[PDB]
Short mmCIF file of all heavy atoms in Angstrom, two decimals:
data_model
loop_
_atom_site.label_atom_id
_atom_site.label_comp_id
_atom_site.label_asym_id
_atom_site.label_seq_id
_atom_site.Cartn_x
_atom_site.Cartn_y
_atom_site.Cartn_z
N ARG A 1 26.00 9.79 -9.28
CA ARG A 1 25.16 9.56 -8.12
C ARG A 1 23.81 8.95 -8.55
O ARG A 1 22.89 9.69 -8.92
CB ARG A 1 24.95 10.85 -7.33
CG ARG A 1 24.29 10.63 -5.98
CD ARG A 1 24.35 11.87 -5.10
NE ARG A 1 23.60 11.67 -3.86
CZ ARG A 1 24.06 11.05 -2.77
NH1 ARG A 1 25.29 10.54 -2.74
NH2 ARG A 1 23.27 10.93 -1.70
N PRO A 2 23.71 7.61 -8.52
CA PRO A 2 22.50 6.91 -8.97
C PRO A 2 21.24 7.25 -8.19
O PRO A 2 21.31 7.56 -7.00
CB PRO A 2 22.84 5.44 -8.76
CG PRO A 2 24.33 5.38 -8.81
CD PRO A 2 24.78 6.66 -8.17
N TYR A 3 20.09 7.18 -8.86
CA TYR A 3 18.81 7.35 -8.20
C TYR A 3 18.39 6.02 -7.57
O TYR A 3 18.22 5.02 -8.27
CB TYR A 3 17.75 7.90 -9.16
CG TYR A 3 17.70 9.42 -9.14
CD1 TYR A 3 18.71 10.17 -9.74
CD2 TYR A 3 16.67 10.10 -8.50
CE1 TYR A 3 18.68 11.56 -9.71
CE2 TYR A 3 16.63 11.48 -8.47
CZ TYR A 3 17.64 12.21 -9.07
OH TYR A 3 17.61 13.59 -9.04
N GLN A 4 18.25 6.03 -6.25
CA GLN A 4 18.01 4.82 -5.48
C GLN A 4 16.51 4.63 -5.31
O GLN A 4 15.96 4.84 -4.23
CB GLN A 4 18.70 4.94 -4.11
CG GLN A 4 19.45 3.70 -3.65
CD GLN A 4 20.95 3.85 -3.77
OE1 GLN A 4 21.68 3.73 -2.78
NE2 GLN A 4 21.43 4.12 -4.98
N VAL A 5 15.84 4.25 -6.39
CA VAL A 5 14.39 4.14 -6.41
C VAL A 5 13.94 2.82 -7.01
O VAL A 5 14.39 2.44 -8.09
CB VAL A 5 13.74 5.27 -7.23
CG1 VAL A 5 12.23 5.27 -7.06
CG2 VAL A 5 14.31 6.63 -6.83
N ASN A 6 13.04 2.14 -6.31
CA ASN A 6 12.38 0.95 -6.82
C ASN A 6 10.94 1.28 -7.14
O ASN A 6 10.30 2.03 -6.39
CB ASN A 6 12.42 -0.16 -5.77
CG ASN A 6 13.83 -0.51 -5.35
OD1 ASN A 6 14.70 -0.74 -6.19
ND2 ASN A 6 14.08 -0.57 -4.05
N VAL A 7 10.41 0.75 -8.24
CA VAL A 7 9.05 1.08 -8.67
C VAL A 7 8.21 -0.13 -9.05
O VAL A 7 8.73 -1.19 -9.41
CB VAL A 7 9.05 2.06 -9.87
CG1 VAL A 7 9.83 3.33 -9.53
CG2 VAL A 7 9.63 1.41 -11.11
N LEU A 8 6.89 0.04 -8.94
CA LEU A 8 5.92 -0.86 -9.53
C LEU A 8 5.09 -0.04 -10.50
O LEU A 8 4.64 1.06 -10.17
CB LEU A 8 5.00 -1.47 -8.48
CG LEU A 8 5.61 -2.41 -7.44
CD1 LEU A 8 4.56 -2.81 -6.42
CD2 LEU A 8 6.20 -3.65 -8.11
N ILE A 9 4.89 -0.57 -11.71
CA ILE A 9 4.08 0.11 -12.71
C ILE A 9 2.84 -0.74 -13.00
O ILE A 9 2.95 -1.83 -13.55
CB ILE A 9 4.88 0.36 -14.00
CG1 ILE A 9 5.98 1.39 -13.73
CG2 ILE A 9 3.97 0.86 -15.12
CD1 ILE A 9 7.03 1.50 -14.82
N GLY A 10 1.69 -0.22 -12.61
CA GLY A 10 0.41 -0.86 -12.88
C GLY A 10 -0.31 -0.10 -13.98
O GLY A 10 -0.53 1.11 -13.87
N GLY A 11 -0.68 -0.81 -15.04
CA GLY A 11 -1.38 -0.19 -16.16
C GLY A 11 -2.37 -1.12 -16.83
O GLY A 11 -2.22 -2.34 -16.78
N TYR A 12 -3.38 -0.52 -17.46
CA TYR A 12 -4.35 -1.27 -18.26
C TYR A 12 -4.12 -0.95 -19.73
O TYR A 12 -4.29 0.19 -20.16
CB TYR A 12 -5.78 -0.92 -17.86
CG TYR A 12 -6.81 -1.83 -18.49
CD1 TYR A 12 -7.22 -3.00 -17.86
CD2 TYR A 12 -7.37 -1.53 -19.73
CE1 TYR A 12 -8.16 -3.84 -18.44
CE2 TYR A 12 -8.30 -2.36 -20.32
CZ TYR A 12 -8.69 -3.52 -19.67
OH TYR A 12 -9.62 -4.35 -20.25
N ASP A 13 -3.74 -1.97 -20.50
CA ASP A 13 -3.53 -1.82 -21.93
C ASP A 13 -4.89 -1.83 -22.65
O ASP A 13 -5.55 -2.86 -22.74
CB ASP A 13 -2.63 -2.95 -22.46
CG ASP A 13 -2.04 -2.64 -23.82
OD1 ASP A 13 -2.79 -2.19 -24.71
OD2 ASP A 13 -0.83 -2.85 -24.00
N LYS A 14 -5.29 -0.66 -23.14
CA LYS A 14 -6.59 -0.49 -23.80
C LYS A 14 -6.66 -1.19 -25.16
O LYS A 14 -7.74 -1.55 -25.62
CB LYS A 14 -6.92 0.99 -23.97
CG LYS A 14 -7.11 1.75 -22.67
CD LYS A 14 -8.44 1.44 -22.00
CE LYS A 14 -9.59 2.18 -22.67
NZ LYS A 14 -10.89 1.89 -22.01
N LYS A 15 -5.50 -1.38 -25.80
CA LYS A 15 -5.43 -2.09 -27.07
C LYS A 15 -5.70 -3.58 -26.88
O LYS A 15 -6.55 -4.16 -27.55
CB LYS A 15 -4.06 -1.88 -27.73
CG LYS A 15 -3.84 -2.71 -28.99
CD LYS A 15 -2.55 -2.34 -29.71
CE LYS A 15 -2.79 -1.37 -30.86
NZ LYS A 15 -3.12 0.01 -30.42
N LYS A 16 -4.98 -4.19 -25.95
CA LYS A 16 -5.10 -5.63 -25.68
C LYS A 16 -6.21 -5.97 -24.69
O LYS A 16 -6.54 -7.14 -24.53
CB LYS A 16 -3.77 -6.18 -25.15
CG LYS A 16 -2.58 -5.93 -26.06
CD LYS A 16 -1.55 -7.05 -25.97
CE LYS A 16 -0.93 -7.17 -24.58
NZ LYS A 16 0.18 -6.20 -24.37
N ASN A 17 -6.77 -4.95 -24.03
CA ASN A 17 -7.76 -5.14 -22.97
C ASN A 17 -7.26 -6.10 -21.89
O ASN A 17 -7.91 -7.09 -21.55
CB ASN A 17 -9.10 -5.61 -23.56
CG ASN A 17 -9.81 -4.51 -24.33
OD1 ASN A 17 -10.10 -3.44 -23.79
ND2 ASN A 17 -10.10 -4.76 -25.60
N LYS A 18 -6.07 -5.79 -21.37
CA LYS A 18 -5.41 -6.60 -20.36
C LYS A 18 -4.74 -5.72 -19.31
O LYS A 18 -4.11 -4.72 -19.65
CB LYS A 18 -4.35 -7.49 -21.01
CG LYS A 18 -4.87 -8.82 -21.53
CD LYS A 18 -3.79 -9.55 -22.31
CE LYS A 18 -3.96 -11.06 -22.25
NZ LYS A 18 -5.20 -11.53 -22.91
N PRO A 19 -4.87 -6.09 -18.02
CA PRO A 19 -4.09 -5.42 -16.99
C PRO A 19 -2.65 -5.91 -17.00
O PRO A 19 -2.40 -7.07 -17.35
CB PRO A 19 -4.79 -5.83 -15.70
CG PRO A 19 -5.38 -7.16 -16.01
CD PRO A 19 -5.78 -7.10 -17.45
N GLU A 20 -1.71 -5.05 -16.64
CA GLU A 20 -0.29 -5.40 -16.64
C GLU A 20 0.44 -4.79 -15.45
O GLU A 20 0.28 -3.61 -15.15
CB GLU A 20 0.38 -4.95 -17.95
CG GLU A 20 -0.05 -5.77 -19.16
CD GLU A 20 0.65 -5.37 -20.45
OE1 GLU A 20 1.34 -4.32 -20.47
OE2 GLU A 20 0.52 -6.10 -21.45
N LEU A 21 1.25 -5.61 -14.78
CA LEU A 21 2.04 -5.18 -13.64
C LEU A 21 3.52 -5.43 -13.90
O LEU A 21 3.93 -6.55 -14.19
CB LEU A 21 1.59 -5.93 -12.38
CG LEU A 21 2.40 -5.69 -11.10
CD1 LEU A 21 2.34 -4.23 -10.68
CD2 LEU A 21 1.90 -6.59 -9.97
N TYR A 22 4.32 -4.37 -13.80
CA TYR A 22 5.76 -4.45 -13.98
C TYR A 22 6.49 -4.06 -12.70
O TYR A 22 6.18 -3.04 -12.09
CB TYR A 22 6.21 -3.54 -15.12
CG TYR A 22 5.67 -3.95 -16.47
CD1 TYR A 22 4.53 -3.35 -16.99
CD2 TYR A 22 6.30 -4.94 -17.21
CE1 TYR A 22 4.02 -3.73 -18.22
CE2 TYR A 22 5.80 -5.33 -18.45
CZ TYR A 22 4.66 -4.72 -18.95
OH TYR A 22 4.16 -5.09 -20.17
N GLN A 23 7.46 -4.89 -12.31
CA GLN A 23 8.30 -4.62 -11.15
C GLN A 23 9.69 -4.25 -11.65
O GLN A 23 10.30 -5.01 -12.40
CB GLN A 23 8.37 -5.87 -10.26
CG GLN A 23 9.19 -5.69 -8.99
CD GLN A 23 9.42 -7.00 -8.27
OE1 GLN A 23 10.56 -7.42 -8.06
NE2 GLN A 23 8.34 -7.66 -7.88
N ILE A 24 10.17 -3.07 -11.24
CA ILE A 24 11.50 -2.59 -11.63
C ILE A 24 12.25 -2.06 -10.42
O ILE A 24 11.76 -1.17 -9.73
CB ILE A 24 11.44 -1.47 -12.69
CG1 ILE A 24 10.44 -1.83 -13.80
CG2 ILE A 24 12.82 -1.22 -13.27
CD1 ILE A 24 10.21 -0.72 -14.81
N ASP A 25 13.45 -2.60 -10.17
CA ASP A 25 14.29 -2.12 -9.08
C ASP A 25 15.25 -1.03 -9.56
O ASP A 25 15.32 -0.74 -10.75
CB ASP A 25 15.04 -3.28 -8.39
CG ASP A 25 16.16 -3.88 -9.25
OD1 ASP A 25 16.53 -3.30 -10.29
OD2 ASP A 25 16.67 -4.95 -8.87
N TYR A 26 15.98 -0.44 -8.62
CA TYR A 26 16.85 0.71 -8.90
C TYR A 26 18.00 0.42 -9.87
O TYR A 26 18.56 1.35 -10.46
CB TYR A 26 17.39 1.30 -7.59
CG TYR A 26 18.46 0.48 -6.90
CD1 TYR A 26 19.80 0.84 -6.98
CD2 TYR A 26 18.13 -0.65 -6.15
CE1 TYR A 26 20.78 0.09 -6.35
CE2 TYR A 26 19.11 -1.40 -5.52
CZ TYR A 26 20.43 -1.03 -5.62
OH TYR A 26 21.40 -1.77 -4.99
N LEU A 27 18.34 -0.85 -10.05
CA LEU A 27 19.38 -1.25 -11.01
C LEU A 27 18.87 -1.23 -12.46
O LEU A 27 19.66 -1.18 -13.40
CB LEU A 27 19.89 -2.66 -10.69
CG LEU A 27 20.49 -2.90 -9.30
CD1 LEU A 27 20.78 -4.37 -9.09
CD2 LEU A 27 21.75 -2.08 -9.11
N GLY A 28 17.55 -1.26 -12.63
CA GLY A 28 16.93 -1.39 -13.95
C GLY A 28 16.55 -2.83 -14.26
O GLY A 28 16.54 -3.24 -15.42
N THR A 29 16.23 -3.60 -13.22
CA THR A 29 15.85 -5.00 -13.37
C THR A 29 14.34 -5.10 -13.52
O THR A 29 13.61 -5.00 -12.53
CB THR A 29 16.31 -5.84 -12.16
OG1 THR A 29 17.68 -5.55 -11.86
CG2 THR A 29 16.16 -7.33 -12.45
N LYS A 30 13.87 -5.30 -14.75
CA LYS A 30 12.43 -5.33 -15.03
C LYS A 30 11.89 -6.76 -15.15
O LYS A 30 12.52 -7.62 -15.75
CB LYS A 30 12.10 -4.56 -16.31
CG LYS A 30 10.61 -4.43 -16.56
CD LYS A 30 10.30 -3.63 -17.81
CE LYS A 30 9.85 -4.52 -18.96
NZ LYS A 30 9.31 -3.73 -20.09
N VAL A 31 10.71 -6.97 -14.57
CA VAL A 31 10.00 -8.24 -14.67
C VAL A 31 8.49 -7.97 -14.71
O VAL A 31 7.99 -7.17 -13.92
CB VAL A 31 10.30 -9.16 -13.47
CG1 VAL A 31 9.49 -10.44 -13.55
CG2 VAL A 31 11.78 -9.50 -13.39
N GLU A 32 7.78 -8.63 -15.62
CA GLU A 32 6.32 -8.60 -15.63
C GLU A 32 5.82 -9.72 -14.71
O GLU A 32 6.28 -10.86 -14.82
CB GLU A 32 5.77 -8.78 -17.05
CG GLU A 32 4.34 -8.27 -17.25
CD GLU A 32 3.27 -9.25 -16.79
OE1 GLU A 32 3.37 -10.46 -17.10
OE2 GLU A 32 2.30 -8.81 -16.13
N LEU A 33 4.89 -9.39 -13.82
CA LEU A 33 4.43 -10.34 -12.80
C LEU A 33 2.92 -10.27 -12.58
O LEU A 33 2.29 -9.25 -12.87
CB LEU A 33 5.12 -10.07 -11.46
CG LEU A 33 6.62 -10.32 -11.37
CD1 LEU A 33 7.18 -9.72 -10.09
CD2 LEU A 33 6.93 -11.81 -11.44
N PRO A 34 2.32 -11.36 -12.05
CA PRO A 34 0.94 -11.33 -11.59
C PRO A 34 0.81 -10.62 -10.24
O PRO A 34 -0.23 -10.03 -9.94
CB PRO A 34 0.58 -12.80 -11.45
CG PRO A 34 1.88 -13.47 -11.15
CD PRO A 34 2.91 -12.71 -11.93
N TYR A 35 1.86 -10.69 -9.43
CA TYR A 35 1.94 -9.93 -8.19
C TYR A 35 3.41 -9.68 -7.85
O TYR A 35 4.27 -10.50 -8.16
CB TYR A 35 1.24 -10.67 -7.04
CG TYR A 35 1.54 -12.15 -6.97
CD1 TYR A 35 2.62 -12.62 -6.24
CD2 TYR A 35 0.75 -13.07 -7.65
CE1 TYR A 35 2.90 -13.98 -6.18
CE2 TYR A 35 1.02 -14.42 -7.60
CZ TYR A 35 2.09 -14.87 -6.86
OH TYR A 35 2.36 -16.22 -6.80
#
């Protein structure tokens, strides 16, 4: 019984000093995006 959840992960990388946005759907389809 799969977990039917889509997520957005917003984080600030303190090492690189860069904001990062990741879009991931319930299948496990990950993409880094500006929006």
